């Protein structure tokens, strides 16, 4: 029910306001998810604190309407403590929805590193070659934080996280969308996640 997780090493001590406050953060994101697709928080609203502090975003497919936004993100939350337990830094990524938090601000800081690339098997069918071409590279040349595009069969779809500048989120795009057409264009089917953006595409299904 989830594409990858991510949980720092470090751990935090338990029953701690580290703790605490990462489970207040959670809680939060579910109810924000009535309001809006992407929102960043801190707990301890106020002045940072020594050790305790938690920064985190979660954010929804751009299309998603509320309901599914709130289904999304209450099951990240709830798969999100089984995998990443007490470590301090935890990212947790499905196909709709992600869910991500920190004990230092990560907004607006690009990270283009590669996560996850996963290629379908090869497609002499010209007409699909083309329209996965033209499809993947689409994804490049639209607009915002989350971009779809369609031809016949085949989808794209790409989307940086919500804290990306409109500059970071086309250069961590380019780097995403490079890799998916370099490495799976001519398949059925791809996707690579990087830190802070992924771009994906399916053929048939
Ligand atoms: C986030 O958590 C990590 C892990 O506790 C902190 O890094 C540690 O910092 C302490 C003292 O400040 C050092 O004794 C450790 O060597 C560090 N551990 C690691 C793995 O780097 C980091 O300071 C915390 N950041 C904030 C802003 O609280
Ligand atoms: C984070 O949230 C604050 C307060 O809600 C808002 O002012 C700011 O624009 C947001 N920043 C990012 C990078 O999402
Ligand atoms: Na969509």
Known sequence: ????????????????????????????????????????????????????????????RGDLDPT???????????????????????????ENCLIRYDNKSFLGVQDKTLILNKCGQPMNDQDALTKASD???????????????????????????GDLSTSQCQDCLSDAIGRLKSDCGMAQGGYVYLSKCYARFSVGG
């Open 1 to 60: 029910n989830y594409i990858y997780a991510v949980c720092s090493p470090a751990k935090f001590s338990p029953s701690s306001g580290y703790e605490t406050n990462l489970n207040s953060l959670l809680s939060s994101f579910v109810t924000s998810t009535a309001q809006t697709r992407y929102a960043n928080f801190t707990v301890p609203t106020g002045k940072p604190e020594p050790t305790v502090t938690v920064y985190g975003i979660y954010q929804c």
């Open 68 to 94: 599914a936004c709130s289904t999304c993100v209450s099951s990240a939350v709830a798969q999100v403590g089984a995998l990443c337990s007490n470590s301090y830094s935890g990212f947790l990524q499905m």
């Open 135 to 161: 499809v993947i590279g689409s994804l490049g040349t639209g607009d915002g934080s989350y971009r779809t595009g369609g031809n016949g069969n085949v989808q794209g779809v790409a989307q940086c996280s």
